[PDB]
Amino acid sequence: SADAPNPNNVNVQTQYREAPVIYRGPEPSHIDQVMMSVSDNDQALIKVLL
Amino acid sequence: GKKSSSSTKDYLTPPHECRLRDMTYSAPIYVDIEYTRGRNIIMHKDVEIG
Amino acid sequence: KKVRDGESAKYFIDEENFTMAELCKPNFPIGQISENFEKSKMAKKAKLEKRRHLRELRMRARQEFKPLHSLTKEEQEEEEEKRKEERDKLESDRKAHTAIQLKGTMAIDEETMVVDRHKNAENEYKEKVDENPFANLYNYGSYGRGSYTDPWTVEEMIKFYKALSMWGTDFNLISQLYPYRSRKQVKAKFVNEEKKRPILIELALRSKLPPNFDEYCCEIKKNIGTVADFNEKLIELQNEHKHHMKEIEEAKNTAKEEDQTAQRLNDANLNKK
Amino acid sequence: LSIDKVLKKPNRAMEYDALLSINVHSNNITSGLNRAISTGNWSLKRFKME
Amino acid sequence: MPVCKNCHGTEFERDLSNANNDLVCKACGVVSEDNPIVSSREATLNNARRKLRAVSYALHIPEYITDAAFQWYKLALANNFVQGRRSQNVIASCLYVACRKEKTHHMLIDFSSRLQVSVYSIGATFLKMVKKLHITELPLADPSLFIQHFAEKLDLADKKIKVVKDAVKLAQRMSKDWMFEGRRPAGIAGACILLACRMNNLRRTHTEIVAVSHVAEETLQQRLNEFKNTKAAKLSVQKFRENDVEDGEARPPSFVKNRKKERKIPRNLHLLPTTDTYLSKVSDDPDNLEDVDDEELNAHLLNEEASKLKERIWIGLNADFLLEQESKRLKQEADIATG
Amino acid sequence: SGIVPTLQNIVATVTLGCRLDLKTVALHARNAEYNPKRFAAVIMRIREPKTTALIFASGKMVVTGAKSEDDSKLASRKYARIIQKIGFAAKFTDFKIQNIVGSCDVKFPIRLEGLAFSHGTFSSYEPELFPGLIYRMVKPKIVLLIFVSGKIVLTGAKQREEIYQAFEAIYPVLSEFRKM
Amino acid sequence: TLKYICAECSSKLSLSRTDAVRCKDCGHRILLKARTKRLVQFEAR
Ligand SMILES: [Zn+2]
Ligand SMILES: [Zn+2]
């Protein structure tokens, strides 16, 4: 989906490779409030603070 | 943000909720204008603009 | 009675109301309402008065046997209402003309053209005439083309069978023979009458009546001259001959103007040296 | 400009497209009014400043 | 990528510690690399993108589906699908197919309201622009989010979940109960929102629902008449049952109109009837035409007497078009003389 | 079961040789529909069934109101006869069948939400443009009209065998999602 | 799974894999996440 092909019946969702964001930090921390929500354009906004 | 039949907005999206939803805190415009609709008819439709 | 929450979930709701049974789907006032009283009340009223307006238009169209001229008569009546509003709300016809002398004046009348700077200056006119209240109505579902018809007159059917016994499948003449109907709806009438009846239509095609009363009705109800093929053919030939003579005279005048321009160019070349 | 774009055909005069077509440039006051306050650069075409 | 010295083709892992993050191999340990280094037609498509932006921000759709409709229009123009339109119908049809891809709530009337175009011509061009697909897999048979998002601008309630969830439950139960197959999703949304509002202790004027839902007044009453016909509606007044069992005796009225179908006022290839024998019997002779003497060949034309009267009628009535045609020929043979 | 569709109407054309003229002979007759519109052609005795069709463009008039090929060519026998009653050549050349319309009903109509949810490769089912399903059969070139009411009506075919092979090959599909 | 605490009336709802995320009868849009049931350990320093 980085390019723009046609929406054919071929497998578009054929791979789900992992590119997350990771806590790069010197000291360990904790998670106290994680929330998933909606934005203006109906997409899953997720905010998490550490 | 008046809407002079009902209340002000009936939500008027709450501010601390609007800070977490990644939405702008807003209330719309309301105007009153004429037209030249018919050959002998002028409407007074009351619309909103942004 | 009024708008009040009588009851629900137990029986027919009756605390302050006029209901005595369930299944209130028919008219669908049941409990109470507190939203959109007057703007939703004055919508079916506007629809009903516009439907009665179109019905009285269809009734008036029977008298004057010209459909689009009846529509222009309707807009002539509403612009008579507009000039009545010009009498009411308010010389007044401050407009322009085909020439530049517009006003008051054509120019100054003292010594020379004084108001030519003001006469040379359309969008300043009389418009505060037609004032009408607003609404929030709609015309959706399907809007555009359509067919406003009625249950047809049986005397119109008798006239149609007499016509088809007298002057048959002649779509334009049948549309002109009923000069307040239209063309596609009487074509649907053609296929509808072709559907249900073989006997009187077969006797009608057996009859072969000569068309004199049809021309009588078409010359009275329309007031058309109907000049014959010799007179109309002679008028068309005279118009074609006048157009050909005008084209030949224009070509000869253009050739004479080109010759005069060539002579003027030769004279300018003689005067340049 | 939209009014002048519509009024250019032998069709019937503009009754309802004047009543409409205000919530098509209604996202010019909102988007500009949010962009100029979320960025901080106010381009004006009558005072000529940035 | 598989460039290494001691092993070949192994996996790799950039370091997390020591702020060093080099791309290193496994089980022997070799960096195997350096340090990491990190850091014409277009005018027509621009006009189409501006028009699609206008219809997108007017029809209240998100920003990604605008680019989806843009790449769909680019692929379609690469397939040369249409030319010379007013482009309102074209952009509306492209945004309609990109919008009916997703489960959002936009019908044909929301597009037909723009530019005051009749909805049937827009649907006709929508079935003319399917001369590129040969896939046509559109998930269109789910009017469930229509109930979820029509109930925000119409049928305003204090709760708007008690009416809405029971509304979509009754509407899906009725659609699975044989009352929806090409049966007006906006109309069934209006019908199973008026019914669920009747379940609530608040009433609506019948004009207020059918105004903004873009549905007729008589059709929703026909729907509610069929709701009164099918459901007994005695237990429906107080409270619906928690365990609703509905099996059999469920049909749209097209089944009824086929059940009565009037008004009183061993498969084999050779046993099928052949159609060439009807064409083979009657002759293919262009010269033989006189075998149809059944009082019709002797009754086509009449005499000269009652024919100049018909010519008089035709020249008297159909005169202005013939005069305009002859005058247009005179206009031509005037203005083609010069250059 | 083993039912057969009944045909409704067929439309074809025929090519003639010379330059025709139906402005004076039809003027000496009963009926003449002088059309100021695009199709400038007159029609005498439209109503008499399976005898007279309608408008010609350049002479190649269509066939209107015919079911069988006896009445289709018998009507075409009566058209070149009128054109020779004018006094012309009126050749009967290239009688090619273009449209045969057939309608039927299997009396047990079936569900279409599953036939449109799963069998979407050969159909474009759109609810309120038109309630009947548009079945795009590619073998042969026939666009079927599947209806919610169940009265299956076929059009666009050029042969009756094409209608039989199109209706027989869809009856197991009708018996697949078969709910009375 | 019993998680996804609301932010207006604090209801324990479990949304499916396709929800277009929405709350319960409170009529809200956002939702937090409940605490895990594991055993966190650390000293009191
Ligand atoms: Zn290694
Ligand atoms: Zn809550």
Which positions 101-130 of E are in contact with F (Cβ < 8 Å)? 107-108, 120, 123, 126-127, 130
Q: Helices H, strands E: what count in chain F?
A: 4, 5
Name E52's Cβ contacts closer than 8 Å, sequence gap at least 6.
Answer: E66, E69, E70, E73, E91, E94, E95
Distance E161 CA to ligand 2 centre (A): 12
Distance (Å, rounded) from C-alpha E234 to C-alpha F146?
37
Burial E232-259 (b: 16+ CB within 10 A, else e): eeeebbeeeeeeeeeeeeebbebbeebe
Is G9 annotated in some ligand binding site? yes
Distance (Å, rounded) from C-alpha C181 to C-alpha C163?
16
Distance (Å, rounded) from C-alpha F171 to C-alpha F174?
5
Cα dihedral F19, F23, F26, F32, rounded to 10, equals 120
CB pairs under 8 A between D and E: 16
Name C135's Cβ contacts closer than 8 Å, sequence gap at least 6.
Answer: B43, C39, C42, C43, C46
* Among the listed residues E127, B34, E264, C51, the one whose alpha carbon sits nearest the alpha carbon of residue F134: E127
Collect all residues of chain A within an 8 Å Cβ-Cβ radius of residue G32: 33-35
Distance (Å, rounded) from C-alpha E223 to C-alpha E200?
19
Q: Are E89 and E121 in contact, with CB atoms under 8 Å apart?
A: yes
- At how many degrees (to 10) do helices C38-60 and C67-89 cross? 130
Q: By what technique were these coordinates determined?
A: cryo-EM
Cα E243 to its chain centre, rounded Å, is 36
**Rg of the Cα atoms in chain F:** 21
Amino acid at residue number F19: R
Q: Are C148 and C58 in contact, with CB atoms under 8 Å apart?
A: yes
Q: Which of E145, E158, E161 to mutate to test the interface with G (most CBs of G within 10 A)?
A: E161
Q: Are E143 and E185 in contact, with CB atoms under 8 Å apart?
A: yes
Asked if residue F83 and residue F41 are part of one domain, the reply reads yes
Site of tokens 């249900």: C196
Closest chain E residue by Cα to residue G28: E161
Q: Are E11 and E26 in contact, with CB atoms under 8 Å apart?
A: yes
- Residue/partner pairs of D13-17 with CB below 8 Å, 24 or more apart: D15/B37, D15/B38, D15/E116, D16/B37, D16/E116, D17/E114, D17/E115, D17/E116
* Among the listed residues E153, E151, E170, the one whose alpha carbon sits nearest the alpha carbon of residue E161: E151
Name C73's Cβ contacts closer than 8 Å, sequence gap at least 6.
Answer: C64
Please name every residue paired with F123 in a beta bridge, in sequence order, or none if there are none.
F135
Closest chain E residue by Cα to residue D7: E115
Distance E29 CA to ligand 1 centre (A): 5
What is the number of residues in chain B?
A: 50
Name F75's Cβ contacts closer than 8 Å, sequence gap at least 6.
Answer: F50, F51, F52, F53, F63, F66
Collect all residues of chain B within an 8 Å Cβ-Cβ radius of residue D18: 35-37
Minimum-distance CB partner of B35 among D18, D28, D33: D18
Asked if residue F48 and residue F1 are part of one domain, the reply reads no
Name E142's Cβ contacts closer than 8 Å, sequence gap at least 6.
Answer: E103
* Among the listed residues C26, C48, C22, F131, the one whose alpha carbon sits nearest the alpha carbon of residue E221: C26
Burial C228-244 (b: 16+ CB within 10 A, else e): eeeebeeebeeeeeebe
CA distance A2 to chain B (A): 25
Distance (Å, rounded) from C-alpha B42 to C-alpha E42?
42
Q: Chains E/F: 3 or more C-beta pairs closer than 8 A?
A: yes
Collect all residues of chain E within an 8 Å Cβ-Cβ radius of residue D16: 116
Return the beta strands (E) in chain C as ranges.
Answer: none
Q: Which of F40, F75, F97 is the last residue of a domain?
A: F97
Q: Please identify every residue whose CB atom is under 5 Å from ligand 1, which is an ion.
A: E 6-7, 25, 28
**Rounded to whole angstroms, what are the CA distances from F167 to E120, E268, F150?**
29, 13, 13
Q: Are E61 and E90 in contact, with CB atoms under 8 Å apart?
A: no
Name E284's Cβ contacts closer than 8 Å, sequence gap at least 6.
Answer: F92, F95
**With an 8 Å Cβ cutoff, are C75 and B39 in contact?**
yes
The resolution in angstroms reads 4.0
Q: Looking at residue G17, what DSSP letter applies? A: S
CA distance B21 to chain G (A): 7
Q: Is D16 left (phi over 0), alpha (psi -120 to 50) or beta?
A: alpha
Among the bound ligands, the one closest to the CA of E7: 1
- At how many degrees (to 10) do helices E41-59 and E64-78 cross? 140
Distance (Å, rounded) from C-alpha A43 to C-alpha E65?
12
- Residue/partner pairs of C218-224 with CB below 8 Å, 24 or more apart: C218/C173, C218/C176, C218/C177, C218/E313, C218/E317, C221/C65, C221/C179, C222/C65, C222/C66, C222/C176, C222/C179, C224/E316, C224/E317
* Among the listed residues F29, F54, F50, the one whose alpha carbon sits nearest the alpha carbon of residue F39: F54
Collect all residues of chain E within an 8 Å Cβ-Cβ radius of residue G24: 161
**With an 8 Å Cβ cutoff, are B21 and A35 in contact?**
no
- At how many degrees (to 10) do helices E308-317 and C229-272 cross? 50
Residues preceding chain discontinuities in chain C with C to N over 2.5 Å: 90, 103, 121
**With an 8 Å Cβ cutoff, are E307 and F127 in contact?**
no
Q: Are C166 and C206 in contact, with CB atoms under 8 Å apart?
A: no
Question: In this structure, is the dihedral angle defined by the CA atoms of residues C178, C180, C183 and C184, taken in order, positive or negative?
Answer: negative
- Phi and psi at residue E234, in whole multiples of 5°? -90, -45
Is G6 annotated in some ligand binding site? yes
Asked if residue F66 and residue F22 are part of one domain, the reply reads yes
Minimum-distance CB partner of B44 among C81, C130, C134: C134
**With an 8 Å Cβ cutoff, are C130 and B43 in contact?**
no
Distance G31 CA to ligand 2 centre (A): 9
Closest chain B residue by Cα to residue A47: B20
Asked if residue F112 and residue F39 are part of one domain, the reply reads no
Closest chain B residue by Cα to residue A38: B21
Number of Cα atoms under 13 Å in the Cβ half of residue E107: 25
Whether A46 contacts chain B with CB within 8 A: no
Q: Which of F82, F97, F112 is the last residue of a domain?
A: F97
Amino acid at residue number E266: P
Name A1's Cβ contacts closer than 8 Å, sequence gap at least 6.
Answer: A12
Distance (Å, rounded) from C-alpha C252 to C-alpha C258?
10
SS3 A14: coil
**Rg of the Cα atoms in chain B:** 16
Integer distance in angstroms from the first to the last C-alpha of chain D? 26
Q: Is E156 left (phi over 0), alpha (psi -120 to 50) or beta?
A: beta
- Phi and psi at residue F98, in whole multiples of 5°? -115, -30
**With an 8 Å Cβ cutoff, are C23 and E234 in contact?**
yes
Question: Subunits touching A (CB < 8 Å, at least 3 pairs)?
Answer: B, E, G
Q: Which of F31, F126, F167 to mutate to test the interface with E (most CBs of E within 10 A)?
A: F126
Distance E37 CA to ligand 1 centre (A): 21
Paired tokens of G43? 């000293």
SS3 F14: strand
Site of tokens 């601008």: E153
Closest chain C residue by Cα to residue E156: C35
Distance G28 CA to ligand 2 centre (A): 6
Distance E25 CA to ligand 1 centre (A): 5
**Rounded to whole angstroms, what are the CA distances from C54 to C57, C76, C146?**
5, 16, 14
Cis preceding-peptide flag for C151 (omega within 30 of 0): no
Distance G5 CA to ligand 2 centre (A): 8
Distance (Å, rounded) from C-alpha C215 to C-alpha E311?
12
* Among the listed residues F61, F15, F68, C164, the one whose alpha carbon sits nearest the alpha carbon of residue F53: F61
Distance (Å, rounded) from C-alpha E101 to C-alpha E138?
6
CB pairs under 8 A between C and E: 135
Q: Are F76 and E279 in contact, with CB atoms under 8 Å apart?
A: no
Q: Are E12 and E3 in contact, with CB atoms under 8 Å apart?
A: no
Site of tokens 């479990």: G14
Distance (Å, rounded) from C-alpha F170 to C-alpha F122?
12
Cis preceding-peptide flag for F140 (omega within 30 of 0): yes
Distance (Å, rounded) from C-alpha B30 to C-alpha C100?
44
Name E200's Cβ contacts closer than 8 Å, sequence gap at least 6.
Answer: E157, E162, E163
Name F40's Cβ contacts closer than 8 Å, sequence gap at least 6.
Answer: F34
Paired tokens of C101? 């002398």
Question: Subunits touching E (CB < 8 Å, at least 3 pairs)?
Answer: A, C, D, F, G
SS3 of chain A: helix, strand, coil, percent, to 5: 0, 25, 75
Site of tokens 């009856």: F171
Q: Helices H, strands E: what count in chain E?
A: 15, 2
CA distance A8 to chain G (A): 22
Distance (Å, rounded) from C-alpha G29 to C-alpha A45?
11
**With an 8 Å Cβ cutoff, are A38 and G30 in contact?**
yes
Q: Are B49 and D26 in contact, with CB atoms under 8 Å apart?
A: yes
Collect all residues of chain B within an 8 Å Cβ-Cβ radius of residue G7: 17
Q: Looking at residue G36, what DSSP letter applies? A: P
> Between β-strands G31-32 and A33-38, what pairing exists: parallel, antiparallel or unpaired?
antiparallel
**With an 8 Å Cβ cutoff, are E292 and F48 in contact?**
no
> Between β-strands A33-38 and A44-49, what pairing exists: parallel, antiparallel or unpaired?
antiparallel
Among the bound ligands, the one closest to the CA of G31: 2
Distance (Å, rounded) from C-alpha E276 to C-alpha F69?
8
Say yes or no: domain G1-45 is CATH 2.20.28.30. Answer: yes
Cα angle C132, C134, C140; round to 5: 120
- Residue/partner pairs of C110-118 with CB below 8 Å, 24 or more apart: none
Query: Exposed, middle or buried: residue E22 (CB in 10 Å: 0-12, 13-18, 19+)?
Result: middle
Q: Are F59 and F16 in contact, with CB atoms under 8 Å apart?
A: yes
Distance E3 CA to ligand 1 centre (A): 10
Query: Exposed, middle or buried: residue C154 (CB in 10 Å: 0-12, 13-18, 19+)?
Result: exposed
Cα angle D30, E66, A7; round to 5: 160
Distance B17 CA to ligand 2 centre (A): 13
Distance (Å, rounded) from C-alpha C62 to C-alpha F72?
43
Distance (Å, rounded) from C-alpha G22 to C-alpha E161?
11
Site of tokens 């037909």: E112
Element (H, E) at F84: helix F69-86
CB pairs under 8 A between A and G: 24
Q: Are E159 and E117 in contact, with CB atoms under 8 Å apart?
A: no
Cα dihedral F134, F138, F143, F148, rounded to 10, equals -40
Please state, as a whole number, how many other Cβ atoms lie within 10 Å of the Cβ of residue E14: 10
Distance (Å, rounded) from C-alpha E332 to C-alpha E329?
5
Distance (Å, rounded) from C-alpha C128 to C-alpha C86?
8
Please state, as a whole number, how many other Cβ atoms lie within 10 Å of the Cβ of residue E269: 9
> Helices in B3-44 by DSSP H: which ranges?
15-20
Which positions 171-200 of E are in contact with F (Cβ < 8 Å)? 180-186
Closest chain B residue by Cα to residue G30: B21
Q: Which of F97, F128, F143 is the last residue of a domain?
A: F97
Domain ranges within chain G, ordered by starting residue: 1-45
Q: Are F176 and F162 in contact, with CB atoms under 8 Å apart?
A: no
Amino acid at residue number C8: S
Domain that holds residue F35: 12-97
Paired tokens of E331? 């206009």
Site of tokens 């950039």: E14
Amino acid at residue number E333: E
Asked if residue F31 and residue F6 are part of one domain, the reply reads no
Among the bound ligands, the one closest to the CA of E32: 1
Distance (Å, rounded) from C-alpha C8 to C-alpha C23?
13
Q: Are F28 and E309 in contact, with CB atoms under 8 Å apart?
A: no
Q: What is the domain-level CATH number for residue F113?
A: 3.30.310.10
**With an 8 Å Cβ cutoff, are C135 and B43 in contact?**
yes
Query: Exposed, middle or buried: residue E96 (CB in 10 Å: 0-12, 13-18, 19+)?
Result: buried
Distance E17 CA to ligand 1 centre (A): 20
Cα angle C176, C181, C184; round to 5: 90
SS3 G27: coil
Asked if residue F63 and residue F2 are part of one domain, the reply reads no
**With an 8 Å Cβ cutoff, are C78 and B38 in contact?**
no
Q: Are F83 and F90 in contact, with CB atoms under 8 Å apart?
A: yes
CA distance C211 to chain F (A): 11
Distance E5 CA to ligand 1 centre (A): 7
Please state, as a whole number, how many other Cβ atoms lie within 10 Å of the Cβ of residue F57: 12
Asked if residue F160 and residue F115 are part of one domain, the reply reads yes
**Structural domains of chain F, count:** 2
Distance (Å, rounded) from C-alpha F144 to C-alpha A16?
41
